[PDB]
Design a protein around this ligand. Sequence first.
Ligand SMILES: Nc1ncnc2c1ncn2[C@@H]1O[C@H](COP(=O)(O)O)[C@@H](O)[C@H]1O
Ligand SMILES: Nc1ncnc2c1ncn2[C@@H]1O[C@H](COP(=O)(O)O)[C@@H](O)[C@H]1O
Lengths: 123, 128
Amino acid sequence: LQVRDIMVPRSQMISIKATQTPREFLPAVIDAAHSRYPVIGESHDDVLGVLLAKDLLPLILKADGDSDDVKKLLRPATFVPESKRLNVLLREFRANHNHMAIVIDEYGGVAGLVTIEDVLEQI
Amino acid sequence: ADLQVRDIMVPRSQMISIKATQTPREFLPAVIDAAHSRYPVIGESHDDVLGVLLAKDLLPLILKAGDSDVKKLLRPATFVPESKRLNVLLREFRANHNHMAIVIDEYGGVAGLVTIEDVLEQIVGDIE
Ligand SMILES: Nc1ncnc2c1ncn2[C@@H]1O[C@H](COP(=O)(O)O)[C@@H](O)[C@H]1O
Ligand SMILES: Nc1ncnc2c1ncn2[C@@H]1O[C@H](COP(=O)(O)O)[C@@H](O)[C@H]1O
């Protein structure tokens, strides 16, 4: 199997727009209750990095944390091609201690996202 | 290799936990530093696990007035014995979609904690 077969497709990704402050994005984030979210720029094809929910914790004890710039909290996205084999990806997740990869198509567009939990249900 | 939970667990003395009497103002510094997704919450001692706190459940405090009692956020813990085999543990993580279990010794005390990531660390191959 390949990543493209088991990915969360681009339309179904819950993403955070990089222009939004926590005041604006947190309601949808809290509703979705995911651990990690792609952060986008101009479009769903413009993935800037990934936001970990737990990385928002420092904002609780700030004066004005609800107005912070999310770009500063970003981790780089791990990118994989659509054709990446699942057995290879699983070994990569172990080596790099990550949970999420952003899937890019043959044109560099964003196909979707894929997680370690999803890989385990398929191989 | 008949691998068991005790072979891969984070032992009790190395667990980062939160005391159920602590406010977020009190526990957040330790929680932020440790940077885990999930924390056992303890009552009277490290053996008295009340449940688990998910870091992501603290997000509403960014917007709310609150940082001065954790118990309302508590999720039930999943408990497993030290002797459970890893193949069985993996099936349970997959069946219940949980990531963490609290490991219990033969006396009912807390031996440590164990995660799905710890299982995969043990069983998945190196990059070839
Ligand atoms: N940001 C996201 N958008 C859409 N689906 C996601 C996202 N993060 C995780 N998932 C899916 O939800 C599952 C559980 O992840 P989580 O909710 O973070 O525990 C994953 O295995 C993916 O299928
Ligand atoms: N509360 C905790 N205390 C100590 N170690 C932990 C805790 N949570 C997770 N771990 C360990 O850290 C690894 C990564 O989990 P996390 O930091 O939550 O992404 C796990 O696989 C465990 O080895």
